[PDB]
Point group: C3
Chain length 426, copies 3
């Protein structure tokens, strides 16, 4: 018996909703929201495709290595329900963020905004320490963030745990955020490392092309009875020396240990503190920003000595085509450049100088590549960003690093690299 049915006529062409009026938008992804602000959804993401070549100190033998990888490949889902409840889930397909055991999350958070301007944020999200870190990874001026953060990257990374943060703008001239987090490392009882963060910024001028910003950061974590990796291992602006998400320098990459050890035993260190300062000034297309931080990792057991590190960076940026870097008091952070000329886009030049010093008195004998005393590095990052349009940014940068009391296997105390990136935001 063959199948059959009466012919149906279908009404065609309209798009409607059964609830509150909806506005839908696309700039390459999708946004849908009710006009009464009760409900919304946004699907987006970011692709950062990098190719780099580098030599000298950046590699073990000093010869040129390369890397061809996605720095980030986020899929981003966020939304609002019942006006005051937001979520944001950003997962990194490149596997550079998060982990196999715990999920490749850049963020998985829920925010209650009912106390606006005060927000309450929960879940897995990087703690707020530092201006360059607060700035979206889409819009950080240099291809990689500064080396001073590499002295204590726990201060502003989620480390596969959970946290709770309160934040607010204040008096139309300031921003404060404070939070507690549990990080993914246990003491001998299976109790996680607990961490406190504070950030406070005074930014009396806080708009694109008109920024005056000074801030303070503090981070503390309790390492009592906890085995942990104390290594400071800066990449000094060259991600490709060691990275997920594609090809890297492999066995010839030199992500060097400037201090600390991979397995510091339970009981070796008691706690770990970092203070930071931020400054920024912007007038139209010109901006200057800088940060300084200092870490003290405090020994517990007498066989161990404190480890200290200090670092800073300063950056100048200028949009040759005249546009301002966006700036938001909510988060006290820079953001994108929006090109005014549709035919040629926006062109931005930048220079960042980084300087770090590691004081690890536990290093008591020379190795083949590392001398007793304070290890140091300086880096220079000079480059161009072409904002083709709001979605696409193409970048090229030259990076140079110079070190003290540490070399590669070739004896190099400096190295050079070039990195190019194609970024697509949707």
């Amino acid at each position: 018996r063959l199948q059959h049915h009466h012919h149906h006529h279908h009404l065609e062409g309209t798009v409607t909703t059964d609830g509150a009026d909806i506005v839908i938008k696309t700039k390459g992804g999708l946004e849908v929201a009710t006009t009464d602000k009760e409900f919304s959804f946004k699907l987006g993401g970011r692709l950062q495709a990098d190719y780099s070549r580098f030599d000298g100190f950046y590699t073990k033998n000093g010869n040129t290595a390369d890397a061809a990888y996605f720095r980030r490949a986020f899929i981003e889902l966020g939304g609002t329900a019942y006006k005051d409840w937001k979520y944001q889930i950003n997962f990194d397909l490149s596997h550079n963020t998060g982990s196999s055991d715990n999920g490749y999350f850049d963020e998985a958070s829920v925010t209650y905004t009912g106390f606006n301007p005060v927000n309450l944020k929960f879940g897995r999200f990087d703690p707020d320490f530092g201006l360059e870190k607060a700035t979206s990874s889409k819009w950080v001026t240099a291809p990689e963030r500064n080396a001073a953060y590499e002295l204590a990257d726990w201060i502003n990374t989620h480390q596969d745990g959970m946290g709770a943060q309160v934040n607010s703008t204040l008096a139309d001239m300031a921003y404060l955020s404070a939070g507690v987090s549990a990080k993914d490392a246990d003491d001998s009882d299976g109790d996680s490392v607990k961490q406190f963060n504070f950030r406070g910024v005074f930014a009396p001028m806080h708009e694109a092309g008109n920024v005056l910003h000074v801030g303070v950061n503090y981070a503390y974590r309790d390492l009592d009875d906890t085995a942990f990796d104390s290594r400071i291992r800066p990449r000094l602006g060259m991600r490709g020396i060691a990275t997920s998400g594609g090809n890297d320098a492999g066995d010839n990459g030199n992500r060097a240990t400037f201090g600390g050890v991979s397995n510091s035993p339970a009981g070796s260190y008691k706690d770990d503190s970092v203070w930071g300062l931020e400054g920024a000034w912007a007038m139209g297309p010109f901006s200057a920003q800088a940060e300084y931080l200092a870490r003290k990792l405090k020994a517990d057991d007498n066989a161990y000595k404190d480890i200290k590190a200090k670092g800073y960076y300063a950056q100048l940026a200028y949009t040759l085509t005249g546009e301002s870097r966006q700036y938001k008091l909510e988060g006290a952070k820079f953001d994108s450049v929006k090109p005014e000329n549709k035919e040629i886009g926006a062109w931005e030049v930048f220079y960042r100088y980084d300087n770090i010093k590691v004081e690890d008195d536990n290093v008591v004998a020379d190795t083949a590549t590392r001398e007793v005393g304070d290890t140091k590095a300086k880096a220079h990052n000079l480059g161009v960003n072409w904002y083709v349009n709001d979605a696409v940014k193409i970048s090229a940068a030259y990076v140079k690093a110079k070190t003290d009391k540490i070399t590669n296997n070739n004896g190099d105390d400096d190295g050079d690299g070039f990195v190019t990136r194609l970024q697509y935001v949707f």
Copy 2:
């Protein structure tokens, strides 16, 4: 030569379709569907953020451990095409469901619904055994499902294989489901473990606030010539003793082996059977439900003896604010509570009692923590669910466990824990 073009005028503001009329909705995610029911799409998900602390038997040394993790972080894509063909793909970003080798699937299925009320379901999906299991993981009353399922978790998990299931409501008073599945373990010829499931429920009253439900479950698998993990390792309501998706109790978590072994050799066991009973009654905001199951893992080689286990739970729940738990005859399962009061939400209290017994006559000598004979555990789970709104549920629960013939390293025969969860459904 500079680029240029004539100015174009674009029509603005309208949203239309070229096919059948579409209705679009958002409650934080996205639904799009043609009004003639031919085509639909839904993007959603669920975040379950847990923080817990626990001690005694829950940890190896008895001291307090913690856990801070996502129990589930699903992204959910489902849709319909040509009316009768549905798909559902739920992937767990927390990596608590599925595996690295095979995909982190909660579900990846295709359902043909053309024989409605009869459905034919194919792909990777948990077999249907048990009421608490059939209930969505969004809406299970207690933070973790009962310990009786932990006696034989193969009965209602997909185990990275594939299956085919037929199901239907019957006579407006019953629900039946039966299926076959291939599970991810091979015999010496590389042929997968095959499993049969049946579930039948009589529910003459089957609506929110008016439920009378009795059901039977059966599961069978053939383990001929197959090496397998026969361990029964209950978490007794405390997920954080050992979990993916974030921080757990690490080396101090005590997910204890009550019976069975990690590598039971090919030829040791022939087959494995489980029978189960379900009962539920609901009148308005009050509900009572309970399940009992019994397992016989039947030895093949004479060196091995049968392993038996029996378990049950009973749960009372009451919505203090008066709302009913939703109930669906399709799937014969409870579902959500929908809050009536928008300002305070819905408040639900629950108590679940669990009781398990493992009879493994292959354990023929004491270990340091486990005595010859039948191992037993009882657990009590007492808690509160706050349904803030349809999307957000916040929970807190106290859990206590007491064991017989098994302790931790500290000699504890009981333990306590507290778990809190923030759930966001979109």
Copy 3:
């Protein structure tokens, strides 16, 4: 103090946009696009659910093994911004494509189309070599692609690297593509393997049911100072002998090494070249296509000898219900069958013959299963595709393989298998 608010009235029912007019569509997924072609977004995917059984040479002992797995489970996000900038991100939830270190990408690309008909494509995407490979994995006629590609699968796989490709149709009768890529393997300096691809097709007739197609392919890679896996390990049409995404034949799967070694040392080989030919002819529901390729892997160090391999396939296909296979000059590739009869769908029968030969003079002694000389295999793939509708395709195929100078442990020189697939495209 209880919460309260004035009652708000909300406008209901409309769906609008603030920019250019939008058209939205769903066939199970989602498409949204502005009518002026400036912006678009598409969320889709593909599920390929496979069950297979196989014996003889396909397994080590010759007995029947099975497999129950997803061949592919892609989530697909693609879009357009500012008219000329496209992206496509396809991630494989089954974990059969890409890797844990680098991301499970089938594709993560950005394409600039402003030079239309010339495209510039960047990112992680399979290089273009071969007609059956260019054809979407949704619409390849046989359940697995041919064995000749298995002789040199680097020629048309991204291998977790990055690349740049230029392509264009020409003169309304041809298609050309050429590209460079960095592949995920380093020389001793950490510099990636670089690869060149060219493909050129003359297709004076290039529409569904009217195809005349001849093409040439070339691929080259530089292996100087690079350790690499030179093994040729064909599955001969039976994916389930060894696969991710679910259960496979495990320890009894025989994915046999026909030549090459797992760790060919740095300096062993200098470069690697493959030439290929393509031919296709289609008249209405009948099509014939074939490809031939030859590889020379050229030794560097004198201890090593060149490895050569040659392979081809030929396929006949006929749509019993009369429909043509779609064909696109852009990409010079076949595509789907679109069923005309809504009640019974489209039915297609196919036969593919594969023939491969591996000449590895480095194999200088017999092993227990492999004789000195040229190893060979032939395979026959006979099957049916039922295109239920545009979204759903169900397939069944018989596969037989016969080998020369290589057997399994049972001494089998042939084997048989059957594979069934349910595919859902959205």
